[PDB]
Every structure is written in structure tokens, then in C-alpha cells.
């Protein structure tokens, strides 16, 4: 089993955070922010 | 069997590698500063790395080679990957 402390699990976790996966968190806060 | 797909971005300072050995992991590398990667047409499916600093060009050539290493297979039979062919100068 690959452990969550793995540097490559952490590396690919990063690339998920740089797709539309995080874009749906960037403008997602902008929703409230115009209110 | 599987063609190695290469995409070039930022005038060739970042390389994207696809379909290596059938893997669907996107092997992406950022070239060291002063290194430009281009795909040459005179010879099929080979890459030209141009730069001013030998250290950065050579290390970038090393980085690409070690990214696409065959794993758990045999070097004897699965001899697939990216290898450095020639080490020369612009003129």
C-alpha cells in the first residue's frame, strides 16, 4: 500500500490541485465574494 | 508498440510525454533554464535540445531519460525509452 506520506502521492495530489479540480474552488469562493 | 507522444510548450521549455509503454500517466518535465526542446523533422521521432549552458542542457537531457524508465520489466527485452544519441554544438 502506498501511504499518504508518500512523496509521489503528494506529487500527484499537487497536479490534481492544478486542474479544474481547484478551479471549481477558485471561482467557487468568488460566488459569495460578489455578495 | 506504443508511440511516445511529445508536446512542446513555452517555446520548448516544457515537455509533455504521453502513451509511453501504454501508460496514461502524463510525464511532464520543465527544462532547466536556458534549455529549449524542439522536434526535428529530418530524422523521425528524435528531439533536439538547444542551449547555452552545457550543464543545464545535459541535465535536462538526463532528466528526460530518467523520467521514462521501464519498470519491473527486462532491460533485455523491454528496451523502450528515450536515449541521448548525439552530443554536439550548434556550429
Amino acid at each position: 500500500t502506498s501511504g499518504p506520506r508518500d512523496n509521489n502521492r503528494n506529487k500527484w495530489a499537487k497536479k490534481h490541485l492544478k486542474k479544474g479540480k481547484r478551479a471549481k474552488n477558485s471561482n467557487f469562493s468568488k460566488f459569495l465574494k460578489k455578495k | 508498440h506504443f508511440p511516445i507522444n511529445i508536446n512542446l510548450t513555452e517555446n520548448g521549455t516544457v515537455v509533455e510525454i504521453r502513451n509511453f509503454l501504454g501508460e496514461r500517466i502524463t510525464r511532464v518535465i520543465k527544462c532547466l533554464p536556458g534549455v529549449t526542446v524542439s522536434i526535428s523533422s529530418a530524422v523521425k521521432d528524435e528531439i533536439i535540445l538547444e542551449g547555452n549552458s552545457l550543464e543545464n542542457v545535459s541535465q535536462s537531457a538526463a532528466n528526460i531519460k530518467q523520467i521514462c524508465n521501464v519498470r519491473n520489466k527486462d532491460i533485455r527485452k523491454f528496451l523502450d525509452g528515450i536515449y541521448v544519441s548525439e552530443r554536439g554544438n550548434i556550429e
Partner: protein, 335 residues
């Protein structure tokens, strides 16, 4: 055995859960709040369509236990600026508003009745007659300070409780520049910030509270805890008679169960429906914060469509959601 990460197992030195960490500030993002403060009214259960690909009940109905906490809109009553120092963050200055309501003034006394109610008299007096000192202090914050945290207090008056001392805490302000935070803070003095403008019904927040005191078994319970990855299902408005009505239910109803929430009361304010358990018993103030980190696990991204919410009688074995339906089914009583 027992985890060693949660010792010394001793009673929490606080009642309101302390936010020991705030999300990293990024100037590319513009200004927003990062936390909130609610009261655990109780929990119910729901029925939901599950849109998780690959899950064995993709596009199938499940049943989920949800925690309902009431969050009347918090009122911003101050701004504080922390300065980076080699010895750590240090609160440089603090600025307040003019009209600090009696709810938050009670927080400054152990006996509000016997006091002379003398809190913030000189400050408010000098606030009106000479605003240059306030301008100077805000100038200091936007010139030196790097972390801007606003005093906000909850309107415990609206809650169906017996407490009257409002709760007070420091919400950090992530977004923009330090000047932008101070402008945002100054534009929200004496105004209220609503939870609809802080959380949006689908994100995944971290819940902080103090556990229910089980007693002495060393000390057991009444510990400070932090649930992570608690997902909002529905942010309801207290003004609408549809806050417990879904699109698959209609049936005009309110989130408060038949007979009022057990040992809490009737929720008539803005509320939040989190999933699963939350620390602490009912009527204990909980803290809600945005997740410290971006994790786009599919559970944190998938949308939610509640099919039906339960308002049966939690005080026993309820079997009727609304008093109208109970009358329709049961024969006409002698009354």
C-alpha cells in the same frame, strides 16, 4: 491502546472551539471571510441521490445522518492587525465600532446586572467626537500589519437559548492586500455578515468544537477536537417556509422537527446542514472554518441534491412529519 496525539487528556481550557490555524493568505484571491460560529441544534437524517461514479450506489438513493446547526448572521464589531515578527505574530492594534450592542458587552463582565455598564464609554465617546485616532490606527494596520482579523460576535439573542453573553472571536480575512482587508473590515462595522455570504451549501468545511463531557472514567470527554472534511448539504434561510422542502418533497415545512428540537428549541434562523456527527452536545457553540488546504477528492467536488428531509418527532418515535399530515391520517380527535 489509545492515541498519543491527544494527550494530556485534560478538560479544554475553553468552551468555544479555538481556530488554531487559518487558511494561507493569497493576494491573487480577493477578499473573503474564513470562518463562522454556530450552535449545534441537533441532527436528523435525509435521503439523497448519490452521484458518485464507480460507487456501488451511483444514481441510487441512500440515507444520511445530518447535523443541523443554527447560525444567525454574525456582526462584525472590530478589526485587528497582526504583524509578522521573528518572535511570531503579534497583535499590533485593535479598532472597534461605535454601537456595540448589549449582547457583546455582556462578554466583558461576569456580572452584567450589578455592573455599571461602563464598557466602551470613553472609546465610543472619542469615536464620535474625534475620528482621527481611528483613522490613524487603521492607517497603521494597512501600513505595518500583515494579518488582519476582524472581531465578530454572534447574535445569541435570536437563538432559542437561555444564555445572553454573546460569543466573540477573531475571523481572519484572506484575500486581496492588507489595504483591501482593512477597507472590507471598515465597510462592515456595525453591520451583519450572513452565512450565505461565507459558505455555499456544497463546500467541505472543518468543524471545531469541544466534546461532550462524559465525566471522570483521568478526565474523559470535554476535549477540544477538530473534525475535518465535513460537507455542507443545505444552507437554509430562517425566513422561508421551504427550508426543509426539497424539489422531490414540496410539502411546505420547516427544518424544526415535530415538537421542537430536543433540549434545544425551535430553529427560526439561518441554519447549516452538515453530514454526520459533530463534536459537542446540542446548544454548544461550534466553530466552522474553510478547509486549510485544497483537496479535490471526488467527495469534495460532487454536487448534492437532497430528496427528502425528516421532521418527525425526535422526542420518542415520531411517525408524522407535519401536523397537517397527522390530522389527515389520524381520525378527527375529540378536540
Amino acid at each position: 491502546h489509545g492515541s498519543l496525539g491527544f494527550l494530556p487528556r485534560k478538560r479544554a481550557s475553553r468552551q468555544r472551539g479555538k481556530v488554531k490555524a487559518f487558511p494561507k493568505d493569497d493576494a491573487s484571491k480577493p477578499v473573503h471571510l474564513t470562518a463562522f460560529l454556530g450552535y449545534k441544534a441537533g441532527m436528523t437524517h435525509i435521503v439523497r441521490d448519490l452521484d458518485r461514479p464507480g460507487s456501488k450506489m451511483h444514481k441510487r438513493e441512500i440515507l444520511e445522518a445530518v447535523t443541523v446547526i443554527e447560525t444567525p448572521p454574525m456582526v462584525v464589531v472590530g478589526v485587528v492587525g497582526y504583524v509578522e515578527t521573528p518572535r511570531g505574530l503579534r497583535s499590533l492594534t485593535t479598532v472597534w465600532a461605535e454601537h456595540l450592542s448589549e449582547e457583546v458587552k455582556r462578554r466583558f463582565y461576569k456580572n452584567w446586572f450589578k455592573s455599571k455598564k461602563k464598557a466602551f464609554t470613553k472609546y465610543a465617546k472619542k469615536y464620535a467626537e474625534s475620528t482621527q485616532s481611528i483613522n490613524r490606527e487603521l492607517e497603521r494596520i494597512k501600513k505595518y500589519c500583515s494579518v488582519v482579523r476582524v472581531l465578530a460576535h454572534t447574535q445569541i439573542r435570536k437563538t432559542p437559548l437561555a444564555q445572553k453573553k454573546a460569543h466573540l472571536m477573531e475571523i481572519q480575512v484572506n484575500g486581496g492586500s492588507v489595504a483591501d482587508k482593512v477597507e472590507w473590515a471598515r465597510e462592515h462595522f456595525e453591520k451583519t455578515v450572513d452565512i450565505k455570504s461565507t459558505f455555499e451549501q456544497n463546500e467541505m468545511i472543518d468543524v471545531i468544537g469541544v466534546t461532550r463531557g462524559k465525566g471522570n472514567e483521568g478526565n474523559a470527554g470535554y476535549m477540544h477536537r477538530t473534525q475535518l472534511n465535513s460537507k455542507i448539504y443545505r444552507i437554509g434561510a430562517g425566513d422561508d417556509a421551504k427550508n426543509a422542502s426539497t424539489d422531490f418533497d414540496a410539502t411546505e415545512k420547516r427544518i424544526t422537527p415535530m415538537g421542537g428540537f430536543v433540549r434545544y428549541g425551535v430553529v427560526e434562523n439561518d441554519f447549516v446542514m452538515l453530514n454526520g456527527a459533530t463534536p459537542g452536545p446540542v446548544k454548544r457553540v461550534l466553530t466552522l472554518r474553510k478547509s486549510l488546504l485544497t483537496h479535490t477528492s471526488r467527495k469534495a467536488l460532487e454536487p448534492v441534491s437532497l430528496k427528502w428531509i425528516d421532521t418527525a418527532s425526535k422526542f420518542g418515535h415520531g411517525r408524522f412529519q407535519t401536523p397537517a399530515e397527522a390530522k389527515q391520517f389520524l381520525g378527527t380527535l375529540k378536540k
